[PDB]
Protein backbone atom coordinates (compact mmCIF):
# COMPACT_ATOMS: atom_id res chain seq x y z
CA UNK A 1 0.00 0.00 0.00
CA UNK A 2 0.98 3.63 -0.60
CA UNK A 3 1.48 5.95 2.38
CA UNK A 4 -0.51 9.13 2.98
CA UNK A 5 -3.51 10.26 0.95
CA UNK A 6 -4.91 11.27 -2.45
CA UNK A 7 -7.68 13.87 -2.77
CA UNK A 8 -10.60 12.89 -5.00
CA UNK A 9 -12.77 15.99 -4.44
CA UNK A 10 -12.44 19.03 -2.18
CA UNK A 11 -15.05 20.75 -4.39
CA UNK A 12 -12.75 23.72 -5.11
CA UNK A 13 -12.07 22.61 -8.69
CA UNK A 14 -14.29 21.31 -11.50
CA UNK A 15 -17.75 19.84 -10.87
CA UNK A 16 -17.46 16.05 -10.94
CA UNK A 17 -20.73 14.72 -9.55
CA UNK A 18 -23.88 13.70 -11.41
CA UNK A 19 -27.32 12.93 -10.00
CA UNK A 20 -29.72 10.04 -10.65
CA UNK A 21 -33.14 8.92 -9.43
CA UNK A 22 -36.11 6.73 -10.29
CA UNK A 23 -39.39 5.16 -9.18
CA UNK A 24 -40.68 8.31 -7.48
CA UNK A 25 -37.56 9.45 -5.61
CA UNK A 26 -35.88 12.77 -6.45
CA UNK A 27 -32.39 14.19 -5.89
CA UNK A 28 -30.60 17.48 -6.59
CA UNK A 29 -27.07 18.72 -5.88
CA UNK A 30 -25.42 22.15 -5.62
CA UNK A 31 -22.17 23.77 -4.49
CA UNK A 32 -22.44 25.46 -1.08
CA UNK A 33 -20.16 26.23 1.89
CA UNK A 34 -18.29 23.08 2.94
CA UNK A 35 -15.96 22.20 5.81
CA UNK A 36 -13.38 24.49 4.20
CA UNK A 37 -14.22 26.53 1.10
CA UNK A 38 -16.82 24.81 -1.08
CA UNK A 39 -18.78 21.61 -0.46
CA UNK A 40 -21.62 19.78 -2.19
CA UNK A 41 -25.14 19.82 -0.75
CA UNK A 42 -27.30 16.81 -1.61
CA UNK A 43 -31.07 17.24 -1.26
CA UNK A 44 -33.24 14.14 -1.56
CA UNK A 45 -36.84 12.96 -1.26
CA UNK A 46 -37.38 9.21 -0.95
CA UNK A 47 -40.25 6.87 -1.78
CA UNK A 48 -40.98 3.24 -0.89
CA UNK A 49 -39.67 1.83 -4.20
CA UNK A 50 -37.68 4.90 -5.24
CA UNK A 51 -33.92 5.18 -5.61
CA UNK A 52 -31.63 8.23 -5.64
CA UNK A 53 -27.91 8.94 -5.68
CA UNK A 54 -25.08 11.25 -6.62
CA UNK A 55 -22.13 9.73 -8.49
CA UNK A 56 -18.52 10.44 -9.39
CA UNK A 57 -17.36 8.11 -12.17
CA UNK A 58 -13.60 7.65 -11.94
CA UNK A 59 -11.13 7.97 -14.85
CA UNK A 60 -8.64 5.65 -13.11
CA UNK A 61 -10.06 2.54 -11.44
CA UNK A 62 -6.91 1.14 -9.84
CA UNK A 63 -7.21 1.72 -6.09
CA UNK A 64 -5.26 -1.41 -5.09
CA UNK A 65 -2.60 0.75 -3.37
CA UNK A 66 -5.15 2.43 -1.06
CA UNK A 67 -6.73 1.22 2.18
CA UNK A 68 -9.55 3.59 3.17
CA UNK A 69 -11.93 6.23 1.80
CA UNK A 70 -12.55 9.39 3.84
CA UNK A 71 -15.03 12.28 3.71
CA UNK A 72 -16.45 15.10 5.83
CA UNK A 73 -20.24 15.10 6.23
CA UNK A 74 -22.93 17.22 7.92
CA UNK A 75 -26.74 17.25 7.96
CA UNK A 76 -28.72 20.35 6.94
CA UNK A 77 -30.72 12.99 10.73
CA UNK A 78 -31.54 10.33 8.15
CA UNK A 79 -29.40 7.32 7.24
CA UNK A 80 -27.76 7.20 3.80
CA UNK A 81 -25.21 4.92 2.12
CA UNK A 82 -21.75 5.44 0.70
CA UNK A 83 -21.35 3.02 -2.20
CA UNK A 84 -18.42 1.78 -4.28
CA UNK A 85 -19.22 0.09 -7.58
CA UNK A 86 -16.80 -2.18 -9.42
CA UNK A 87 -16.52 -2.23 -13.22
CA UNK A 88 -18.95 -4.46 -15.13
CA UNK A 89 -17.86 -7.92 -16.33
CA UNK A 90 -19.27 -6.97 -19.75
CA UNK A 91 -16.92 -3.98 -20.06
CA UNK A 92 -19.46 -1.16 -19.90
CA UNK A 93 -21.62 -0.25 -16.90
CA UNK A 94 -21.41 -0.89 -13.16
CA UNK A 95 -20.36 -4.11 -11.45
CA UNK A 96 -20.57 -5.42 -7.88
CA UNK A 97 -21.97 -2.85 -5.43
CA UNK A 98 -20.30 -2.41 -2.03
CA UNK A 99 -21.96 -0.37 0.72
CA UNK A 100 -21.45 1.35 4.07
CA UNK A 101 -24.31 3.05 5.92
CA UNK A 102 -23.74 6.46 7.53
CA UNK A 103 -25.94 8.98 9.36
CA UNK A 104 -25.10 12.69 8.87
CA UNK A 105 -25.40 14.72 12.10
CA UNK A 106 -25.78 18.42 12.98
CA UNK A 107 -22.00 18.97 13.20
CA UNK A 108 -19.15 18.28 10.75
CA UNK A 109 -17.57 14.87 11.23
CA UNK A 110 -14.86 12.99 9.35
CA UNK A 111 -15.89 9.48 8.33
CA UNK A 112 -13.02 7.16 7.39
CA UNK A 113 -14.10 3.75 6.09
CA UNK A 114 -11.52 1.02 5.39
CA UNK A 115 -12.25 -0.83 2.13
CA UNK A 116 -12.31 -4.05 4.19
CA UNK A 117 -15.26 -2.58 6.14
CA UNK A 118 -17.54 -2.31 3.09
CA UNK A 119 -20.36 -4.86 2.82
CA UNK A 120 -21.68 -6.55 -0.32
CA UNK A 121 -25.01 -4.98 -1.33
CA UNK A 122 -28.02 -7.31 -1.13
CA UNK A 123 -31.10 -5.19 -1.93
CA UNK A 124 -29.74 -4.62 -5.46
CA UNK A 125 -26.91 -5.74 -7.72
CA UNK A 126 -26.54 -4.64 -11.38
CA UNK A 127 -26.53 -7.22 -14.24
CA UNK A 128 -22.79 -6.67 -14.78
CA UNK A 129 -21.72 -7.73 -11.26
CA UNK A 130 -18.96 -10.35 -10.94
CA UNK A 131 -20.60 -12.18 -8.00
CA UNK A 132 -17.10 -12.62 -6.51
CA UNK A 133 -17.98 -11.53 -2.97
CA UNK A 134 -14.71 -9.57 -2.81
CA UNK A 135 -14.28 -5.83 -3.32
CA UNK A 136 -11.74 -5.73 -6.14
CA UNK A 137 -9.82 -2.51 -5.58
CA UNK A 138 -8.01 -2.72 -8.94
CA UNK A 139 -11.36 -2.47 -10.77
CA UNK A 140 -13.31 0.52 -9.41
CA UNK A 141 -15.97 2.19 -11.57
CA UNK A 142 -17.51 4.88 -9.36
CA UNK A 143 -18.34 6.19 -5.88
CA UNK A 144 -21.81 7.17 -4.66
CA UNK A 145 -23.71 8.91 -1.90
CA UNK A 146 -27.10 7.23 -2.19
CA UNK A 147 -30.42 6.16 -0.61
CA UNK A 148 -30.71 3.75 2.31
CA UNK A 149 -34.46 4.17 2.94
CA UNK A 150 -37.74 5.80 1.83
CA UNK A 151 -37.22 9.03 3.82
CA UNK A 152 -36.13 12.58 2.93
CA UNK A 153 -33.21 14.78 4.00
CA UNK A 154 -30.38 17.18 3.20
CA UNK A 155 -26.63 16.85 3.75
CA UNK A 156 -23.30 18.41 2.74
CA UNK A 157 -20.07 16.59 1.86
CA UNK A 158 -16.46 17.75 1.59
CA UNK A 159 -12.86 16.48 1.37
CA UNK A 160 -13.47 13.13 -0.32
CA UNK A 161 -10.11 11.35 -0.40
CA UNK A 162 -8.30 8.01 -0.43
CA UNK A 163 -6.15 7.03 2.55
CA UNK A 164 -3.25 4.59 2.34
CA UNK A 165 -1.02 3.32 5.13
CA UNK A 166 0.01 5.48 8.07
CA UNK A 167 3.66 5.83 9.09
CA UNK A 168 3.61 4.10 12.48
CA UNK A 169 6.58 4.97 14.71
CA UNK A 170 6.11 2.14 17.24
Beta bridge partners of 7: 161
Inter-residue contact 9 to 160 (CB < 8 Å): yes
Could you give the string, one character per residue 118-137, with x where binding to Ca ion holds by CB under 5 A and - elsewhere? ------------x-x---x-
Other C-beta atoms within 10 Å of 115: how many? 19
Interface with Ca ion (CB under 5 A), residue from 34, 46, 104, 153: 34
CA distances from 127 to 74, 94, 99, 139, 141 (A): 33, 8, 17, 16, 14
Interface with Ca ion (CB under 5 A), residue from 80, 96, 147, 157: 96
Nearer to Ca ion, 46 or 96 (CB): 96
Nearer to Ca ion, 48 or 90 (CB): 90
Stretch that binds Ca ion, among 40-48, 69-77, 118-126, 150-158 (CB under 5 A): 150-158
Amino acid sequence: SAVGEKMLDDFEGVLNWGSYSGEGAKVSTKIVSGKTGNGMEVSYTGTTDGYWGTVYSLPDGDWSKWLKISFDIKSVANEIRFMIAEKSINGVGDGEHWVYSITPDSSWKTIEIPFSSFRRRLDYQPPGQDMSGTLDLDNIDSIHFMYANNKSGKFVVDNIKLIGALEHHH
